[PDB]
């Protein structure tokens, strides 16, 4: 409780449940003296899950499909209403693939499903920032963050069209980082996070834990790092893809990972 | 004339005119002993230019919208009929942004325009590979190349949504490289080619900018058996640009600009 | 003044004068509630410059050639004495090239001078960390930072053998990051900083200012960012080369840089 | 046999035995119509193995400690005498760590050992290029390659100070690439080659690990005129390893390891 975000206002997407990273950013950002507004889809809100978080953080849950420019124009107006003007930061934490959910392989994509994957997981970020820019919703030296994963750089079996969506997301962070930065000094970055619970499940989380010298970064560790990016101490950090993974991105082989791999290869013999 | 591609068969997208990289790849690939099939839009073919290349390369041009799975299915069928079965290599050299054409700023995109940008410039690559995979069109140890640009990594003002499309294209090369590679050992790579920006890149690059002729020669290596273990790479072909922070030549021009200010 | 480094102890190398980045990290780290020890060469101290900073921050200036394992073993003992035990963080900010100073070009190196360049600018970092590790000088979840520059990745005319030294420095951060991390969860990173005053002079600082949407990062901006890395909020950030450059690393061409370049190319005609 | 290097002349360091990449580069380079000169340490030559390669390649082996500027001066003189003037390409394939040989952990390095590691594995590359530049030994549009490994970017437990030496080697390629390129248009690149680690890399890489034969073929492309605009690059030649996060094959082996635990 350093009061890092004292007198700072933000919008957080993608708080579903207590386990979700955007949920932890929300409750941890207020803890640091921030006012926030929450958003998710009606089918996400109606369940009644996020409302509980929007009790804790005081503040409101504004319904919006983040792929709908209309829903985003409403979201920004209702967000700016609630704060009584501009805000400082925004957390984008959205992404799913109908290709993954319908069990299509990467060499058997449905291209309507792919358009949805790219729209929900990446273009939504551009849409959210463009609506904000047009309504001048964000103060000078504000901070926009989107969550990403290293499949954007290095292919992960079964992660499918989400890898390509994360690459597109990270590029939008650069492209829009330049425009918003040269104009109003607003910084835009991606945090490339460890695989986190709720093919990003059991065996992969063990591999990444063992490979990473500091182990996997928790959702709480992620929330911790993101606060730094919303603080004035990261003002000159923009257009970056920041690995938050206990060193995973910088590792070829750990002794601990090889010890497991060698057993898989040798144990029987 | 090394006969690098003797006995090899190729499909080439994006040959428009004599200045096109894809055009130079087609004529160099035939010089190196490859058989090829050309493809572009019906409208491109109708303008009469690509027919000149098909005659020189002793082959056919098959009309296809590369964003249309149906057209790509027809194309792969006609290509395999022309060759009498499977082929070895494929060049994707397509890309266009309606947002750029209409002079839209990056913070005033049309999202229907952006959909077209991504589809023509990136998803068209996935579509062509997936149709080829389903028809088993490509021989084991085949080679697929798409052309890209460093805006995929580093922002160029005014390159607009094409930067994001290139980032997506390069990711498709990796995603599909893994899938096509593990089975049939087909390699998939992007060549990040050279492009006032032209003058800046020329002076920044110790060897100067790569020409379309230069790029054609480099792509031949990737279709050759000599690059069989090179896959899922984004290969800078730019006379050193991607590895430069500042050259003497580029700094001298910039300094003169600071003094005229 | 968030009290980020409340009850935290560190060692800072390379404070020469008020303009120097390690000087600003020192005075800014105490401001955030840290105790520090200062070090430089006798010829740096004797001038009497750093002593003034070691008045402001209370604490001592311990003389040490950071290329001498003997001087470093003394430094760590005297540092741990002064704190009455282990410390938490360490700032490495050392580097020069006799090749640069004697005006030799990269294709006319003196190889004794190169050994010195690599030793002062990179191997010194390994030496400092190895001495610390052998004396268990650093608490669990401690943070080691070395300052670097993008010439490590992208060649800069006239920057000479320093580019190769920065590449070697950044690699040591990874190599030692893994060892110190898997054992005692100590994180190790490099901050790749903007060109900063005291070929990293006038025309280059203008180019980097114009190219970077947020302009060059100051020594004060750098000190700000480094505090985040010493804080508990970056615990899972290790083996990273972190660009702090107003977006330089992520830029191909800004409108503002091209406006200057086009004048250089066209103005006369 | 493409005659890729017809009329070209090369100097090759690091050929020890039939299994060496440098050995395979020498014999493939001659097959492709190059003339070469071989170099290794006096002690290496005395063991009798490399003389077999010099006979096959119809050439000489010149003794040189590649860390000795004096020996490199003698080598470049003898090479240029053998060829009757300038040559086109050079392969650096040297590297050894006394710290690794003596089983020193990375947090217990000997700094005299580390000096030797850096000198043999990295600075030797600068030394050879600088001596070649001063004697103007290399033709315009020549090609210099050194062999590297991805430990330069991503940490492998037990690869030790060799990881840092590879990071330094790759930086020298860029630093010297710019200087040699701007004048004489000589390209300088590193090839980041494949290497239980061998099994892990084989299963992670969609195409499997690159062999020394594979690497020789790829290096031929970099000595050929077809790669003239490729410089200051670190080129992964690894069947896709550098672009992989996790493969099905690698994950299956790892899963079996988790269950045996």
mmCIF file of N, CA, C and O in Angstrom, chain D residues 54 56 91 103 113 123 146 149 178 185 203 215 222 224 228 234 238:
data_model
loop_
_atom_site.group_PDB
_atom_site.id
_atom_site.type_symbol
_atom_site.label_atom_id
_atom_site.label_comp_id
_atom_site.label_asym_id
_atom_site.label_seq_id
_atom_site.Cartn_x
_atom_site.Cartn_y
_atom_site.Cartn_z
ATOM 1 N N UNK D 54 42.782 -31.339 -46.763
ATOM 2 C CA UNK D 54 43.563 -30.458 -47.662
ATOM 3 C C UNK D 54 43.901 -31.208 -48.965
ATOM 4 O O UNK D 54 43.933 -30.565 -50.039
ATOM 5 N N UNK D 56 42.128 -33.831 -50.336
ATOM 6 C CA UNK D 56 40.810 -33.973 -51.012
ATOM 7 C C UNK D 56 40.426 -32.643 -51.677
ATOM 8 O O UNK D 56 40.031 -32.672 -52.857
ATOM 9 N N UNK D 91 35.027 -18.563 -43.311
ATOM 10 C CA UNK D 91 34.223 -19.217 -42.263
ATOM 11 C C UNK D 91 35.039 -19.243 -40.976
ATOM 12 O O UNK D 91 36.151 -19.810 -41.020
ATOM 13 N N UNK D 103 35.026 -27.826 -15.534
ATOM 14 C CA UNK D 103 33.767 -28.063 -14.802
ATOM 15 C C UNK D 103 33.465 -26.975 -13.787
ATOM 16 O O UNK D 103 32.794 -27.278 -12.793
ATOM 17 N N UNK D 113 40.450 -17.886 -17.298
ATOM 18 C CA UNK D 113 39.721 -18.865 -18.140
ATOM 19 C C UNK D 113 38.696 -18.102 -18.996
ATOM 20 O O UNK D 113 38.628 -18.375 -20.204
ATOM 21 N N UNK D 123 36.503 -12.913 -29.836
ATOM 22 C CA UNK D 123 37.472 -11.849 -30.246
ATOM 23 C C UNK D 123 38.338 -12.332 -31.423
ATOM 24 O O UNK D 123 38.670 -11.533 -32.288
ATOM 25 N N UNK D 146 30.344 -16.652 -39.176
ATOM 26 C CA UNK D 146 30.752 -17.361 -37.939
ATOM 27 C C UNK D 146 29.590 -18.214 -37.443
ATOM 28 O O UNK D 146 28.439 -17.757 -37.602
ATOM 29 N N UNK D 149 25.145 -20.085 -31.505
ATOM 30 C CA UNK D 149 24.147 -20.967 -30.851
ATOM 31 C C UNK D 149 23.226 -20.077 -30.017
ATOM 32 O O UNK D 149 23.689 -19.077 -29.485
ATOM 33 N N UNK D 178 28.847 -3.576 -40.397
ATOM 34 C CA UNK D 178 28.555 -2.181 -40.802
ATOM 35 C C UNK D 178 29.819 -1.605 -41.456
ATOM 36 O O UNK D 178 29.768 -1.031 -42.550
ATOM 37 N N UNK D 185 31.328 -3.453 -49.337
ATOM 38 C CA UNK D 185 30.056 -4.204 -49.511
ATOM 39 C C UNK D 185 30.246 -5.670 -49.119
ATOM 40 O O UNK D 185 29.540 -6.519 -49.692
ATOM 41 N N UNK D 203 12.865 -32.808 -30.792
ATOM 42 C CA UNK D 203 11.392 -32.988 -30.626
ATOM 43 C C UNK D 203 10.702 -31.620 -30.644
ATOM 44 O O UNK D 203 9.548 -31.530 -31.139
ATOM 45 N N UNK D 215 23.952 -27.686 -42.289
ATOM 46 C CA UNK D 215 24.543 -26.365 -41.953
ATOM 47 C C UNK D 215 25.504 -25.950 -43.065
ATOM 48 O O UNK D 215 25.485 -24.801 -43.478
ATOM 49 N N UNK D 222 25.102 -18.403 -48.209
ATOM 50 C CA UNK D 222 25.620 -17.122 -47.671
ATOM 51 C C UNK D 222 26.924 -16.710 -48.377
ATOM 52 O O UNK D 222 27.183 -15.516 -48.430
ATOM 53 N N UNK D 224 27.377 -17.577 -51.614
ATOM 54 C CA UNK D 224 26.878 -17.405 -53.001
ATOM 55 C C UNK D 224 26.459 -15.952 -53.243
ATOM 56 O O UNK D 224 26.186 -15.216 -52.291
ATOM 57 N N UNK D 228 23.725 -11.549 -51.472
ATOM 58 C CA UNK D 228 24.563 -10.325 -51.459
ATOM 59 C C UNK D 228 24.012 -9.227 -50.538
ATOM 60 O O UNK D 228 24.820 -8.462 -50.027
ATOM 61 N N UNK D 234 21.760 -12.617 -37.516
ATOM 62 C CA UNK D 234 21.966 -13.884 -36.774
ATOM 63 C C UNK D 234 20.898 -14.867 -37.291
ATOM 64 O O UNK D 234 19.714 -14.616 -37.000
ATOM 65 N N UNK D 238 17.957 -24.397 -37.569
ATOM 66 C CA UNK D 238 17.659 -25.196 -36.365
ATOM 67 C C UNK D 238 16.336 -25.973 -36.538
ATOM 68 O O UNK D 238 15.816 -26.419 -35.530
#
